């Protein structure tokens with residue numbers, strides 16, 4: 228993804244990981260088409276909520292612009308408008 232978007236995720240990494248429950252966000256991104264079911268299972272396998280969110284963010288950091296926007300939209304739609312507001316200015 229564009230550096231602007233990546234740097235924004237890094238800036239806000241700790242809050243994102245602190246706060247996010249992954250299950251609904253991930254099904255949103257899978258329905259959208261920008262997270263695979265194999266990626267989802269890797270996240271789901273982690274044994275705590277912080278560790279699942281850490282895995283998800285780790286994955287997203289390696290994806291493209293279209294995936295950043297899908298993640299952003301999932302935050303907007305699945306109960307994290309606060310976190311979406313932090314990532315808005317980083318949209319590719």
Ligand SMILES: [Zn+2]
Nearest residue numbers: 253254257267
């Ligand atoms: Zn799923």
Ligand SMILES: [Zn+2]
Nearest residue numbers: 255301304305
């Ligand atoms: Zn959704």
Ligand SMILES: [Zn+2]
Nearest residue numbers: 255259300301
């Ligand atoms: Zn969507």
Ligand SMILES: [Zn+2]
Nearest residue numbers: 268269271272
């Ligand atoms: Zn497995």
Ligand SMILES: [Zn+2]
Nearest residue numbers: 240241244281
């Ligand atoms: Zn972390």
